Amino acid sequence: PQITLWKRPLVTIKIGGQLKEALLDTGADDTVIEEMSLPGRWKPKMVGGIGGFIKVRQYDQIIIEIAGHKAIGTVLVGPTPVNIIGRNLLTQIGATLNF
């Protein structure tokens, strides 16, 4: 699809067996999802933005369906105010910014 930017570019994702809404975010290096359980090992990380940093759990090799496109990668889990699909997974679905 072609998604215009008049509105937030929200899509449905499936992660850990759960359907969620998430933002397609070219300004995010990494994918950051609100607190939920995921299987396997994790390690702590800090991620920073406007307003400062939050502590997250970094889970590697997590499969996420994004607008019906499968992608695998690292997912960060923590107290983000919105679910964010960052560049690490946008690349895998072939997303580009065009103007």
Is 29 one of the annotated active-site residues of the chain? no
CA distance linking residue 85 with residue 77, whole number of Å:
12
- From 36, 45, 54, 65, residue interacting with its own copies (rule: CB under 8 A): 54
What are residue 16's phi and psi, to 5 degrees? Answer: 60, 30
> Could you say whether residue 61 binds Na ion (CB under 5 A)?
yes
- From 26, 37, 70, 72, residue interacting with its own copies (rule: CB under 8 A): 26
> Could you say whether residue 58 binds Cl ion (CB under 5 A)?
no
Q: If you ran DSSP here, which 8-state letter would residue 92 be given?
A: G
Partner touching 68 among its own copies, Cl ion, ligand 031, none, CB below 5 to 8 Å by kind = none
Residue 91 structure tokens: 């690349």
Residue 40 structure tokens: 């396997």
Residue 44 structure tokens: 């702590």
CA distance linking residue 96 with residue 99, whole number of Å:
10
Contact positions vs its own copies (CB under 8 A): 1-6, 8-9, 23-29, 32, 47-54, 67, 69, 80-82, 84, 87, 90-91, 93-99
Interacting residue ranges for ligand 031, rule: CB under 6 A: 23, 25, 27-30, 32, 47-50, 80-82, 84, 86
